[PDB]
Every structure is written in structure tokens, then in C-alpha cells.
Paper text:
DNMDP and related compounds, or velcrins, induce complex formation between the phosphodiesterase PDE3A and the SLFN12 protein, leading to a cytotoxic response in cancer cells that express elevated levels of both proteins. PDE3A is a well-characterized cyclic nucleotide phosphodiesterase (PDE) that hydrolyzes cAMP, cGMP, and cUMP8,9. Here, we show that PDE3A and SLFN12 form a heterotetramer stabilized by binding of DNMDP.
To gain insight into how DNMDP induces complex formation of PDE3A with SLFN12 and how trequinsin inhibits this interaction, we solved the high-resolution crystal structure of a modified form of the catalytic domain of PDE3A (PDE3ACAT-Xtl) in the absence or presence of DNMDP or trequinsin. PDE3ACAT-Xtl is comprised of residues 669–1095 with two internal loops between residues 780–800 and 1029–1067 replaced with shorter linkers to aid in crystallization and improve diffraction quality of the crystals. The catalytic domain of PDE3A crystallized as a dimer with two dimers in the asymmetric unit. The structure is very similar to the structure of the catalytic domain of PDE3B23, with which it shares 69% sequence identity, with a root mean square deviation (RMSD) of 0.53 Å for the main chain atoms. The PDE3A crystal structures are essentially identical, with only small movements of the protein backbone at the active site to accommodate the binding of AMP, DNMDP, and trequinsin.
Residue numbers in the entry:
A (entry chain A): 669 to 778, 799 to 1027, 1069 to 1092
B (entry chain B): 669 to 779, 799 to 807, 812 to 1027, 1069 to 1094
Write the structure that this text describes.
């Protein structure tokens, strides 16, 4: 009855690709091909490596069997849809891990904290978020990333609301998908003792952990995007700036992190970004087909007979991703390298991809 | 499948009690006894009278059969529990109707379709300032706002990881459920479609307003609403009746006051509601004990603390809400210039009563 983790828990044939997790442009589609498309193991295998990298299994005395059981059940419940699938979830988890573990130039760091085995810079002039965000909160962020699109139907909130879908009625039209992802992932977790990887958290810790997970998942609703960005910019630019000893400031940083991780695509290398773009529109077209079937007008960018890739991505960058990156970068939280100047791979890719789409539009 | 409204849709022989709807201390428990306890008709019968009083049937071409079918289905889905039952829903509907239709001293009329009570310079009423569609949303919200309440608090559902708490991610667990279950009920059958003559835009807006009103009844958000309202009252210009967001906030404050009206009623009514509230709490206390949890404050039948419960509820929740609402100039009242406000007078009297009980208990 329970979905259990397969075979030997850890797949041994993935070592050369898994070693490359510590790069921003992780070749996730190579990992997909290496594991097999619809093998249904990518999320659990990556989650294991990242938790091991951070020493989170030891930190919270996490039983590995139950961890693998849960993450396998979770990944199986991501649908076989073109974008909001277990590969995207894995991508978002990798991105939050990267953003929280990799060197950030000029960040001061503060036991209750974990650090990546990949963290090699001995220079005072770098820090990382995992030096400032307690391990319990970091683990909540990582678990949130893994569960944040669970059981996505391949339709937007707007479609669910407009069609009075049962889920939209159930959630009173408020963050319909994001509520469902959190609630269905938590229901799954609670359903079986074979999934209880959090058994060694005390009651207070567990309740706090759950709260943090929910807050992070719910922050992925883009209806709230401008409010988060405005609030963060406010905190950065007030009298003291970000206060790492303040739990509310730390939550806001975690929310900005999962937000950036969710929409990381246009800040990846061209090859990755173009592959993800294909997934996004292919999912949209299935929605467009259903809209037509229901006699509704086809939503912008969702008409397979009239594709608008460049307009979609150019406007997504200009309106959503660009301002979020600028805000996060202004706070001094982007990974980068001293060269002193700073070289920031992430913002460089975003600029390059924005230029690319603009040029497509021009032609 | 569908629950349909009984017999002749409107019960005759209730006329003498129904004529008293236009008083604040409406004798609702006499109405209960007159209709019959667990007749399961009180909410639909009162709903009919108030919609008729406002001419809402004509205003929105509402078919009476479908209206009665829906409101009867709705009332049947309120459980037989001591407080959050169909009698409380009826009470809250009556209170929102009273607050929106009765004379308010010095309230100006906005310079939309509006409706007025058949019961209606120096006075105004809210129904003169809030469009009929929005008023109707508020009334429907009041009727559905505790639908299928299980007789346990949000905090209990959250602490016990109840399926509803998991479903709603611990956020306004009951209130989300009331709205969602009442709307699901509505949509389930064509026999319930009393809003058939609203156009699509109107319907979607109506649904939004109903949800916003029901969700506003979560007391976790109490101080946020009060602070926001006090902000709007005391800013540049005050309440702007032509502003849809200001109007929504007023409607939310209205349903909030209506929900917790009990301590602002005459002693007889307040004491009867108090008995219901604690009896429902004690069932929760019994279950807490059964589950090996500590018994929540005020929920221990072996050690009742009615006076401490109600004194603190008035001082911390009802009192500040009334003060905020009164500061906005929205309380029904009479010119004596000074104003005489029955509602705040009752609240003062009940507060004094509980304080005296506490004094004798020490
Ligand atoms: Mg999502
Ligand atoms: Mg309630
Ligand atoms: Mn996502
Ligand atoms: Mn209520």
C-alpha cells in the first residue's frame, strides 16, 4: 500500500554526474537521461546527495530509509506533465541548495549551523547563507523546494478559478495550487510511519518546521511576487538592514531564496534555459487545448498554432525575474567571485538571455 | 439527492414573533421554541423575511423556491452542537441586517443599485452607502459563515493535526471550510441556484465578497482588522463610500461585530449564549483530556470560569471592536449633542455584571 523507496536506496551509477551538483548550470537533463525518463527517482537521488553534503542526516538523526521512502512517494506524485514535474522540483531544490551554500562575496557569517562539503574558500571575504540561517530553517527550505509543486495538474491558478475547478472551490480561489501542493505533500507525509524522517525533531521543532515549510511553499504564488519584493527591498534599505538574529528577517530571506530558485531558468546558461522554455510552453499548450475545448478564449502564450516564446520570456524577465534578481543582488546575497570587482554568473546569464529574447523579437 | 425546502415555503403563525425582527434584542430563543427545537427551519424562515424586507427578491430576480431550497440545505448542514449551530447563524444574519438597516446618527448618504428596509437629515443607514449586491453578499456570508462547524476551535484542529487543519495548512482552518463547504453545497445542484439572474461578472464578484466576509470572522485576524479600520478612519479623508475597498472593510467589520454580538445584547440573551459557548467548550475539554492533552483555559467542566472567560472576551475582543466601529460613527443610535447607543450600553452593563461575579469569586 505505501510507496517505498526502490532496491539499494542509493543508485551507485550516478557518481560522475552527481559530483557536478556544485555548479550553477548543473546538467540536469543529462541526469534525466542517465537515470531514465520517468524512472521516477531523480528527486529522491538528488535529495539524498544534498542532505549528505550538508550533514543533515547526522544533524537531525534522520533515518535514511524513511527519508528515501518519503521522497520517492513525493516524486511519484509529481505528474507526467511537461514542466511542473519531478525534474523541475529537483531543479528548484538544487537552486536553493546552491544559493544557500555557495560563496557570497562580502557576506559576514556566524553548532546550530551546517555547511556544504563543497565550501572551499578560506578567504574572510566570502560567506554563505548556511552560516547565517540555522540548520532547521535551511532543512525546511530544502524540503519546501522538493514539495513545492507536488501534484501540479498542469493548469494555472487562473484557469482553475475561471473554470470553478473543485480545487479552486476548496481553497476559496486563494493560492489554489500552492495550498494544494503543501497540503497534499503534508497529508502524504503524515499518512504512513514509513515516511517519518522527522521522528527525532521534538514537538516544538516539528511544529516550527511545518510552519516554515508552508510559508516557503505559499511564497511561490506569483500573485504575491510584488509584495515580497517590496517588503524585502524595504528591509534591506531601512535603518539596520537584514538582521540575521531576527527570525522574521531570516524567513523573508528564505522566501526570496525559494522564489529565485523557482524562477531560476532565465538565469541559467542558454542551453538549459531554452530546454526549460520548451517544457513551459508545451504545458501551456495543453491548457490552451482545454480552454478551446471548454469554449473559453485561449490564454496569452498558450496557443500552439500561434507560439510566442520570445514575448513570453522577454516579458517574464522584464517584469518578474529581473526585478527579483536586482533586489536579491542589491541585498548582497548573490553567489559570485571576487575578480576588486565582483563577477556574478547568475546575473550575467540573466542579462545574456534577456538580450537573446530581445533580438528574437527584433527580427 | 437534493435537500428541498419543506411544505408551504413560508411558515404562517410566526407573525407575532417575526414582527419583532426590527429590535436589537430580538427574542431568538422564543422563535426557536415557536418553530420547534431542531425543526431545522429557523435560518431559512428568518432569511426569507429579511430578504423580503429589503426587496432583494425583486432587486435580483431571485426565485423563492431555489432560495428556500438552498437556505434549508444550508441550515440542515449546521450541526446539533451547543453554540455554532443554525440558531447562531440566524442570530448573526439578524445582527448584520440590523446594523445595515437601522438609523445611524449623523451618517451621511453617499452622493449603483441600493436597497432599503421597509422599516427605514440627521440619520442615515449603511444600506444607503453599500450597494445592494455587496449588502446581499454580506447577508449570505452571515448565513453560511459557520456552516458544518465541528464544535472545536482552530487551535484544537491544528494541535491535533486534524484532516481539515492539514488540508488548509493551519490557516483559518474552520473559516476556509465554512466558505468552501457552503459554496460546494450551492454549486452541487441546480435546485439551489437562487443567483441565476446575476451575470457572470456579478456572480464572480459576489463570490469574492462572500468569501472575504466569511474569512474575516477568524479571530486570529481580529487585531489586524481593527488596526486597519482604525487606520482608515483616522487617515486623510476617513471612510470613502465610493471606494470599493473601504466598503469591503466596513462589511468585514459589520460581520465581525454581528458574529460576537452576544455580550452587547440584553442580559437574558447574553447569558443564554454564554451557556451555549461554554457547553461547546466543555465537549472540547473532554476530548482534550481523552487525548492526553492539557485542558484548554475555560474548557474544563469540573472547573468552570464563565466570568473570567466573558470578562476577558469583552475587555480584549468585543470592547475594542465596538470602540473602533463607534469611532467610525457607524453604531446605530439615537440623538439625545450626545448620542444614546443601546449596543454599547448593553456591553457596559454585561461587563460590569461579570466583574461583580469575579469580585465575589474572590
Ligand atoms: Mg508552483
Ligand atoms: Mg466561526
Ligand atoms: Mn515551481
Ligand atoms: Mn460565528
Amino acid at each position: 500500500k505505501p510507496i517505498l523507496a526502490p532496491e539499494p536506496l542509493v543508485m551507485d551509477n550516478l557518481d560522475s554526474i552527481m559530483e557536478q551538483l556544485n555548479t550553477w548550470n548543473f546538467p540536469i537533463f543529462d541526469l534525466v537521461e542517465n537515470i531514465g525518463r520517468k524512472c521516477g527517482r531523480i528527486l529522491s537521488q538528488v535529495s539524498y546527495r544534498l542532505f549528505e553534503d550538508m550533514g543533515l542526516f547526522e544533524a537531525f538523526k534522520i533515518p535514511i530509509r524513511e527519508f528515501m521512502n518519503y521522497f520517492h512517494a513525493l516524486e511519484i506524485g509529481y505528474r507526467d506533465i511537461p514542466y511542473h514535474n519531478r525534474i523541475h522540483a529537483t531543479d528548484v531544490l538544487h537552486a536553493v541548495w546552491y544559493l544557500t551554500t555557495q560563496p557570497i562575496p562580502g557576506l559576514s557569517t556566524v553548532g546550530s549551523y551546517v555547511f556544504s562539503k563543497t565550501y572551499n574558500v578560506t578567504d574572510d571575504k566570502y560567506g554563505c547563507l548556511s552560516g547565517n540561517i540555522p540548520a532547521l530553517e535551511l532543512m525546511a527550505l530544502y524540503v519546501a523546494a522538493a514539495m513545492h509543486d507536488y501534484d501540479h495538474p498542469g493548469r494555472t491558478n487562473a484557469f482553475l478559478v475561471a473554470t470553478s475547478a473543485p480545487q479552486a472551490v476548496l481553497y476559496n480561489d486563494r493560492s489554489v495550487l500552492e495550498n494544494h501542493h503543501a497540503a497534499a505533500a503534508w497529508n502524504l507525509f503524515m499518512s504512513r510511519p514509513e515516511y517519518n524522517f522527522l521522528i527525532n525533531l521534538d514537538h516544538v521543532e516539528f511544529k516550527h518546521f511545518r510552519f516554515l515549510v508552508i510559508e516557503a511553499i505559499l511564497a511561490t504564488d506569483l500573485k504575491k511576487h510584488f509584495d515580497f519584493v517590496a517588503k524585502f527591498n524595504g528591509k534591506v534599505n531601512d535603518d539596520v538592514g537584514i538582521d540575521w538574529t531576527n527570525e522574521n528577517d531570516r524567513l523573508l530571506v528564505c522566501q526570496m531564496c525559494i522564489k529565485l530558485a523557482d524562477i531560476n531558468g532565465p538565469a541559467k546558461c542558454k542551453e538549459l534555459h531554452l530546454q526549460w522554455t520548451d517544457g513551459i510552453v508545451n504545458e501551456f499548450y495543453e491548457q490552451g487545448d482545454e480552454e478551446a475545448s471548454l469554449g473559453l478564449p485561449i490564454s496569452p502564450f498558450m496557443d500552439r498554432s500561434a507560439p510566442q516564446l520570445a514575448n513570453l520570456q522577454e516579458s517574464f524577465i522584464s517584469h518578474i525575474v529581473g526585478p527579483l534578481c536586482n533586489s536579491y543582488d542589491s541585498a548582497g546575497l548573490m553567489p559570485g567571485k571576487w575578480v576588486r570587482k565582483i563577477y556574478c554568473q547568475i546575473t550575467q546569464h540573466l542579462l545574456q538571455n534577456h538580450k537573446m529574447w530581445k533580438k528574437v523579437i527584433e527580427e
